[PDB]
Unconditional design. Structure first.
Lengths: 175, 175
């Protein structure tokens, strides 16, 4: 049982909490974007899976776009509550959430909210230049269902919450 | 029970393993050098306590001397096995151990081993200059029961394993 505890300490890479939702979960991470679709935080088979960080994101300080995935569970668990952000009332009352990494906590300031079925541009993690990230931000701001008070520049860094399972639900916020 | 999991994710700051010992434990940490003398990794009252990192050590990259504490338990658990290093045969066969932090793993190269009852110079964590850490290293090398092949300079950084409860047992190694 302490073998399982050592496993958990490598696998769990953070914590996520959004007030007034079920989303209050450990963030897991493996070598791909698949294992934690099908396993819980104890590494046992489970359809609900876990909340998990994209395998490409391994540097908080430099990653321009860190992506966290979870199922849109029909029982309302995992990332089903991301859809509350399509209700304007909820968004105004919850402009931020908290994201812990392995080091420390951030209060993320949401600036874009949308659903998407076939346009997955938002999953880019690699930006040769600072100018490439500003093109990215322009595109995803335009994809948003709201115009945001929050301005954000190619100099900022962001975090993306996304379902992974018709359309995905996506929330993006400024670190 | 997920409230307890969130607690554990802030409290557990690393992992320690020394081959051929019981020492294969999570490293915990609180705001002082006392809580984890009396509580286990689930934060429940327990005499064995936990293995824990000195509250003063909060920066892997700059801390010249990171100290990890555990009880010298009479049932052979926790840090009772540190005393195996007074047997030369064991030390030759185990010149290193592994220390995980919140970020990553190190293979620590042991360079000093001793018991101490009243001379606690080794617990210094603050070194104004690089010259102060070289004075420190000179003192603790002299305190060692062996002369070490491993040389270490004021430019290196170290990790200290120590019991905490007649004498403490102390192992110090190069990062
Ligand atoms: Cl679409
Ligand atoms: Cl002494």
């Amino acid at each position: 049982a302490l073998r399982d505890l050592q496993k958990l300490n490598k696998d769990m890479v953070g914590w996520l909490t959004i007030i007034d939702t079920e989303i209050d979960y450990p963030i897991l991470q493996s070598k791909d974007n698949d294992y934690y679709l099908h396993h819980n935080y104890k590494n046992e088979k489970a359809r609900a899976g876990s909340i998990f960080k994209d395998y490409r994101n391994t540097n908080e300080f430099l990653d321009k776009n860190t992506i966290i995935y979870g199922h849109n569970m029909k029982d309302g668990s995992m990332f089903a509550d991301l859809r509350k952000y399509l209700d304007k009332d909820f968004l105004v009352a919850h402009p931020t959430f908290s994201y812990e990494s392995g080091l420390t906590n951030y209060e993320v300031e949401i600036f874009a909210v949308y659903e998407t079925t076939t346009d997955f541009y938002y999953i880019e993690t690699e930006f040769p230049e600072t100018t490439d990230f500003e093109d990215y931000l322009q595109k995803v701001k335009q994809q948003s269902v709201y115009t945001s008070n929050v301005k954000v520049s190619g100099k900022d860094r962001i975090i993306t919450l996304s379902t992974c399972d018709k359309g995905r639900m996506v929330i993006q916020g400024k670190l």
